[PDB]
Structure 1
Amino acid sequence: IQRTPKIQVYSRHPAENGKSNFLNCYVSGFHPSDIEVDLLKNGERIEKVEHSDLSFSKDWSFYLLYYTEFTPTEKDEYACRVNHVTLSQPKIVKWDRDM
């Protein structure tokens, strides 16, 4: 149902500090499927923001997962901003090492 889109700032593998990785934002349990999700890296937004196709999340709602190539690191201000009907203000969750 129309619930707050649960965001998850993490990565595919371990947060390789200073090495190649892949930031991913898993936002599930939201309605409708419309949910503008973007990645941020040190204030500005990340270049790549490609997200997988949505599907029936565990909460019987929409589910989308974003990914992007970038060097994972807790020092770099890497976050995830989401905006939709349920998530009024652009919720920006800081992306640390994992979820």
Structure 2
Amino acid sequence: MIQRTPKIQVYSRHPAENGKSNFLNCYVSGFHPSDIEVDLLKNGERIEKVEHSDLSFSKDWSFYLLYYTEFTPTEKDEYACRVNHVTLSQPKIVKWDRDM
């Protein structure tokens, strides 16, 4: 049994611009086993219409997934990624930084 804890990045598909439609991305990578819960949050509440890639893996056998949802960034709205896994004492929440 190896157990590896996920790395998480939260970012947009295109450079972010208020009122312009785009995609919000949560990339989880480096993990094992494969069972993992990923939600995208808007102002604290889960977004329903989220898609994910098919499970694949790297040369070290660790897994990766991309979760993504169509969104329009605005002034007031905050976006985050919540991830749960057997290696985490409780779900990790990672805020979307617009620069990054």
Scaled by the length of structure 1, the TM-score of the pair is 0.87
Of 72-81 and 33-42, deviating more is 72-81
- Could you tell me which residue of structure 2 aligns to residue 25 of structure 1? 26
**1:73–1:97 contact (8 Å) kept in structure 2:** no
Q: Runs of 5+ in structure 2 lacking a partner?
A: none
| Closer/same/farther in 2, CA of residues 34 and 79 from structure 1, 3 Å limit | same
Question: Displacement of 1:92 after TM fit?
Answer: 0.7
Question: Displacement of 1:47 after TM fit?
Answer: 2.6
| Closer/same/farther in 2, CA of residues 41 and 29 from structure 1, 3 Å limit | same
Aligned residues between the structures: 99
| Closer/same/farther in 2, CA of residues 80 and 3 from structure 1, 3 Å limit | same
| Closer/same/farther in 2, CA of residues 51 and 88 from structure 1, 3 Å limit | farther
List per-residue Cα deviations over 1:13-54 (Å, max 9, x = no partner): 111222201101000000111111000001111232211112
In percent, how many aligned pairs have the same letter? Answer: 100
**Bigger fraction of residues in strand:** 2
Q: Runs of 5+ in structure 1 lacking a partner?
A: none
- Could you tell me which residue of structure 2 aligns to residue 96 of structure 1? 97
Moved beyond 6 Å, runs of 4+? none
| Closer/same/farther in 2, CA of residues 91 and 60 from structure 1, 3 Å limit | same
Question: Displacement of 1:60 after TM fit?
Answer: 3.4
Of 51-60 and 25-34, deviating more is 51-60
